[PDB]
Copies of this chain bind each other. A is one copy, B any other.
Amino acid sequence: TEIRVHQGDLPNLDNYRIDAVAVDTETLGLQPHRDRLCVVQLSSGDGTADVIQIAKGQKSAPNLVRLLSDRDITKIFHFGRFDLAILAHTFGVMPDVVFCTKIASKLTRTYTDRHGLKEICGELLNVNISKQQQSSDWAAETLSRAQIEYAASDVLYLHRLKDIFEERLKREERESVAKACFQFLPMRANLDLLGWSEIDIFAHS
């Protein structure tokens, strides 16, 4: 499987003149103010991925950020709440056109409580995601082949999952519900950055 590794940014957008792009991130942890963005992964859905190493202190990634800003391109995430927060914190741009397979799973796979990407890929695609490298030093100057393959696996299948989840949202008549959740998701990520990451803002208490 072809995985193109880059330093800093995509060299150009020639592989991303598309309606929808799969996006994922790797970091030194779950706390965007402490744990820096280390990797950004992209896939056009053609079975290949781009794995972009983000340097410490890196302030710009113009080609990546152009995609994230392009309202004509849907950014597909799994649990985009996290990715949106670290991407916006790092480069100062919050995408506003998104699809999230974890929210989609919670709205459609009502017959299970397991909504992780590994579980979804196994059930919907018979694809095995290995999570061995999930907790690894993503800030390493040189990523191992296993790290690169894990990072790519998080974006290689999101188009196919989105297709299936769109079928399920239509079947159960929840398209407008999913759309409103996706519309709010960038602000949910902003709330996390602003200090409400532990607070369900809609809860009674």
Task: Check A33/B112 contact, CB under 8 A, given A28-B172, A136-B123, A187-B181.
Answer: no
Measured CB to CB, the nearest residue on chain B to A103 is B201
| Copies of the protein in its oligomer | 8
Within 8 Å of chain B (Cβ to Cβ): is A43? no
Task: Check A34/B194 contact, CB under 8 A, given A111-B138, A183-B184.
Answer: yes
A167-199 interface bits toward B, Cβ cutoff 8 Å, 1 = contact, 0 = none: 010011010110011011101101100111001
* Chain B residues in 8 Å Cβ range of A45: none
A-B CB contact pairs (8 Å), 5 listed: A28-B172, A123-B136, A177-B191, A184-B202, A188-B202
Interface residues of A (CB under 8 A from B): 27-31, 33-35, 56, 79, 81-82, 102-103, 106-107, 109-112, 114-115, 123, 134-139, 168, 171-172, 174, 176-177, 180-181, 183-185, 187-188, 190-191, 194-196, 199-205
